[PDB]
Amino acid sequence: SRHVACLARSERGLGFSIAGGKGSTPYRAGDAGIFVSRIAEGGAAHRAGTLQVGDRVLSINGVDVTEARHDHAVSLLTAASPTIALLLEREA
Amino acid sequence: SRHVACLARSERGLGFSIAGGKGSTPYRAGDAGIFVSRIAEGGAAHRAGTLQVGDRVLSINGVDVTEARHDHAVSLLTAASPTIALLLERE
């Protein structure tokens, strides 16, 4: 139920977004976590095959984001470069 | 025929894909609209049963997307409320 996704920043867009977070509009009802919210079919995330929309983001390059605010997590993700390592949690 | 479909984001998100949009290679000839292109076998859209691949997306939570760019429709679907109201058109 836990998966790591590794994404290299390149010429090709990463093709995903995250939503949610403490103090933000929940991405899903009753859960303030950070989740993968979209995946573009021509981006790195889709090409990697390791990310799925709705996956909960637990950490970004080793940094726990299970209680992060949205903007803090977005700031962490843009400072995760050239490589992004995500720890993901997925339901059945 | 026009149908309203209502979906709450869950473990697979909304659980479908959209294709098309103004300025993009069209999903259907000469028609740059937003269409439901896939439905995941798990997830909210699949459990609801109210979406069909090939459905034209006319509006998302009241916002007309008949002439929208793809990223605008993606934002409507993922950056607003977790509950999504879709107006869909079928041939």
Binding site: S37, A40, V53 | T25, V74
Partner: peptide, 8 residues
Amino acid sequence: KHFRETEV
């Protein structure tokens, strides 16, 4: 122009 498809 590019074909755009996105999972949501």
